[PDB]
Design a protein around this ligand. Sequence first.
Ligand SMILES: [Mn+2]
Ligand SMILES: [Mn+2]
Lengths: 209, 206
Amino acid sequence: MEVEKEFITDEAKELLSKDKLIQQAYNEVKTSICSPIWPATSKTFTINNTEKNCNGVVPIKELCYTLLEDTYNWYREKPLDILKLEKKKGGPIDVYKEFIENSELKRVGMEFETGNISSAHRSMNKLLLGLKHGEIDLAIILMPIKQLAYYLTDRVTNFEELEPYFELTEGQPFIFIGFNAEAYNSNVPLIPKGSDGMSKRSIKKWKDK
Amino acid sequence: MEVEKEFITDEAKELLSKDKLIQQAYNEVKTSICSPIWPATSKTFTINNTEKNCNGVVPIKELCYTLLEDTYNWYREKPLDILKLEKKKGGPIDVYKEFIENSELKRVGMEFETGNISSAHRSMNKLLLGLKHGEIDLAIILMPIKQLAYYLTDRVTNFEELEPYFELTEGQPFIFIGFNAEAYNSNVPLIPKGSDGMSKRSIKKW
DNA sequence: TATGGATCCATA
DNA sequence: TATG
DNA sequence: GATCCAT
Ligand SMILES: [Mn+2]
Ligand SMILES: [Mn+2]
């Protein structure tokens, strides 16, 4: 899989330029989002393009999550204090990791969005809430680009559609990443939908795993 | 329907307390949200409570919209300039209306929310863009409270679930109102459902 | 009465 | 179409 | 948007 579109707020730009931990975080993310391949035996991600919305979205995220968790030690389901403790209403953040160098601690919150475009709004708002409350130092959202989305489940989050809203993160360190497949071909099998598209293995939860 | 819950930002509070036009607008939207009744032959709204998530949601906003449009002259599906003209990406807001008292103009934008709770985030953000871009002077969202939502299609917007995010509108004139039915009872009807998404009636080729 | 999806619908 |  | 699904 490969990164094609991207928006980085001025605050995130600053971090990326002068902070080694953030640079590291960003690189781990980038490598992970580029790792998904299809089919399982391929070196690149070729999406079946027989028709509009022909592919499921779940199997697409597995390799990226696996690398983040197993190779880079990122955790899943990190509850935000303001939601879990304070307002006691709201779910956790998708992916999370604490980077450390001596006395410096950098907490990065991330969301791999393949849900409906409206869900991307909730994901952005939750990360924004965490950022505004000083719980994370950087927020990231990964999502397919419009071209790729065309062959995935209808209405799935896509870079272009959420783009008009990136400006609501102004004043905060935020990175939006849009990925695309390397090839489009009807020769590869369809990414399964529903039950058949799952497995998703035992994940590394922050509560611990 | 009846208004059971409500959150009014401090900016909206000032408008409501001081501005006549905003008061009129607020008044109009409230009568409108109270409007929807069920069944048709009734003067109140009674939700069928036979089972959790047993009622569809589509018919619920009809009367609300009717009043606003016909009786109050609100405009449906108003496209915001930032989205339609500037960004050329994104759809319109549910209802909009300009209140005029010569020299003074107040534009109010509103979103009736019965879509999935995630969709409420898109609605709130769109109203936020409008506000931020000075296209509206007040934003309002209408949505069922959890108690009522319990008998509507699963995961539809409910006041309590969007509540933890109300703070993202700090500094903007925003009003969030949660409506509820007058009664939960036996009935001749049950609000019908569409074949959307995972409904057993939807076509799934897989 | 929790909560983030995943998948399909209607109408431009 | 693209968008709620 | 509107219906359900997996935890
Ligand atoms: Mn709308
Ligand atoms: Mn609406």
